[PDB]
Design a protein around this ligand. Structure first.
Ligand SMILES: C[S@@+](CC[C@H](N)C(=O)[O-])C[C@H]1O[C@@H](n2cnc3c(N)ncnc32)[C@H](O)[C@@H]1O
Ligand SMILES: C[S@@+](CC[C@H](N)C(=O)[O-])C[C@H]1O[C@@H](n2cnc3c(N)ncnc32)[C@H](O)[C@@H]1O
Ligand SMILES: C[C@@H]1NC(=O)N[C@@H]1CCCCCC(=O)O
Ligand SMILES: C[C@@H]1NC(=O)N[C@@H]1CCCCCC(=O)O
Ligand code: SF4
Ligand code: SF4
Ligand code: NA
Lengths: 332, 326
């Protein structure tokens, strides 16, 4: 005479606990990231409910420009732009400011409300390039009216002050993977170098955007470790890339993830970080295909449009239509 | 928990119970915020009573235009100026070429579809029988057909040649049928369904969302399919045709469509429920939601007077949802 309960009850219980002020434990998150295919839609649904409980129904749209491309001394095993790997990538110096402003203007027409200057290379060690970056970041913000981001690699405290002064509101630095996996993906810089960078940005009063890449041979457990590590670092802006394997790099042959594995991972990040702005970045179109729309009703509330650094995306108008079709709104 | 009743009703159904009309009306009004819980529960009901396969079908427009029926939605009606291609029953070799293409595209079954009230000329009908035979026996697809109003004697002949699905949409709820057609009636459809069933053929019957029905009428439509023991249900979404009285009907919101699909699954837990016409146009990048939100079949390869996307994309999507084919 007791009704039979479904396999997905724990998902409901935990979601309720979080929406009532509790927190998921590591063991719980590990269980949830192993959710079945059959129960995945309940997990995604409950992530969407957590998202709604702690945030509005807006989707934050960003876009980037590869303002300086290729020729990087770092050996990050996934990156097209490393010198240790022949990938046939475009190489060029810092774009001229009018060219950058054009891209800024296109990103705004496309529906981005914030825009990142991204450069290859460890850091920006020449103080003249840095100065050019500051100059054009200012023009973007004051003349185009976009919030400004940047991804400049390793960052000193003095640089972060300057970024803060010119009006940067997100400083991007990805942890890439779980601390326990970072040695297996890069050796020319360390995890510690990422901590320094992130700390320096935070101490200058800049909200840090930090995430990483699913599909680097991390275990599911390590994806959970990565989320809690972001929690530790007080990160509330999280871009989740999915590896786009680059011919010539060592991760060329990395096995593709199953779309539902990716979507489950997104949902579990939401459970672990209920108040964060969590977004897709690289690899969305190619690795989620016709399931991309699941992300924004499965725990994510941001999207990078207009393509990436050395890899493309779909038309941003299709992305704006998808947001509308999901009955979500566009931020700011 | 604003979505608690969704969970309770779903669990009741999976423990052997039935949704009430009143409850179905409430569920079809689920908020946007609660829509994913509804789709999830419909996915659980689909899994509980069926399996994890997606049935892939395709069609050919074998005879086009010049229909004396005045269905307000239909491009092939003669009462409406619509610019539709008109042609009599296609030649065997063309039809077989279309069937080969469908099979290559991943369809397990294939429908000869005709404009018209019916086929009255017994010779034209035998031509239909002849080619149905060659499709099944030579190309090796299961065979469906959609020939309009059907007599018992016609149904026996289709059974004999090996037709495994006879298609005849009810289109809408009985209470809305007069508002879409007056050259034939709702009861005309009821005789056709009975005739096909009594000959031993599984009937495939659904209809069209977006014909100005109320949400309540969509529920009525599902309950009628329930009463009729229909277990193969194609859910079309109106593609408004220029020149028809419904050319200016408003598009439905994707989530409204998906909520409707989910509610049909709650009412018909055991049924093979598929998308048909207007899927790509009206669901766009939310099409994938249907197969993890209550549906378990898909029509690929485009329609009668309207196209579809690449079937390979459709097959990839099935695979990406961790579903199988058969
Ligand atoms: C951070 S930007 C370059 C700026 C600077 N060099 C740095 O390392 O911060 C390059 C970022 O794109 C992502 N990325 C690079 N190659 C990728 C690939 N093949 N697939 C997916 N994401 C990738 C990584 O997460 C990486 O943090
Ligand atoms: C049923 S077949 C034609 C065979 C036969 N004349 C009959 O009415 O049964 C045509 C089917 O396509 C669907 N259909 C027609 N025009 C449509 C449109 N504009 N949008 C969506 N579905 C449509 C209807 O459900 C209709 O039953
Ligand atoms: C820098 C942006 N922020 C982020 O987390 N990834 C974006 C870049 C992704 C690059 C994808 C691979 C390529 O285009 O080379
Ligand atoms: C006959 C098939 N089965 C069904 O229920 N609908 C299909 C036809 C869809 C037609 C869409 C509009 C057109 O192409 O004219
Ligand atoms: S991710 Fe950054 S640091 Fe690593 S190789 Fe690419 S450009 Fe260099
Ligand atoms: S009976 Fe069939 S072909 Fe004729 S108008 Fe109606 S749907 Fe169109
Ligand atoms: Na389903």
């Amino acid at each position: 005479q007791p009704s039979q309960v479904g396999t997905y009850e724990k998902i409901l219980t935990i979601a309720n606990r979080i929406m009532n002020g509790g927190e998921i434990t590591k063991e719980e998150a590990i269980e949830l990231i192993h959710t079945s295919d059959d129960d995945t839609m309940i997990l995604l649904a409950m992530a969407d409910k957590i998202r709604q409980h702690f945030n509005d129904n807006s989707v934050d749209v960003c876009a980037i420009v590869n303002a300086r491309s290729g020729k990087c001394p770092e050996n990050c095993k996934f990156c097209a732009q490393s010198a240790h790997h022949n990938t046939g990538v475009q190489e060029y110096p810092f774009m001229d400011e009018e060219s950058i402003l054009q891209a800024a203007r296109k990103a705004k027409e496309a529906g981005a409300i914030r825009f990142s200057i991204v450069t290859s290379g460890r850091n920006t060690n020449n103080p003249d390039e840095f100065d050019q970056i500051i100059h054009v970041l200012g023009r973007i913000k004051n003349e185009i009216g976009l919030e400004i981001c940047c991804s400049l690699g390793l960052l000193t405290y003095e640089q972060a002050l300057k970024l803060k002064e010119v009006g940067v509101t997100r400083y991007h630095s990805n942890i890439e993977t779980a601390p326990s996996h970072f040695p297996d993906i890069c050796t020319t810089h360390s995890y510690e170098d990422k901590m320094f960078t992130i700390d320096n940005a935070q101490k200058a009063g800049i909200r840090v955007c930090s995430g990483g890449i699913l599909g680097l041979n991390e275990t599911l457990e390590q994806r959970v470790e990565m989320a809690f590590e972001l929690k530790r670092l007080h990160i509330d802006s999280v871009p989740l890339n999915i590896l786009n394997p680059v011919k010539g790099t060592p991760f060329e042959s990395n096995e593709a993830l199953r779309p539902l594995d990716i979507l489950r991972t997104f949902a579990v990040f939401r459970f672990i970080l209920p108040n964060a702005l969590i977004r897709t970045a690289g690899g969305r179109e190619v690795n989620l295909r016709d399931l991309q729309a699941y992300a924004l009703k499965g725990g994510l509330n941001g999207i990078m449009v207009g393509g990436y650094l050395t890899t493309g995306g779909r038309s941003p108008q299709d992305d704006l239509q998808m947001i509308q079709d999901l009955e979500l709104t566009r931020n700011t």
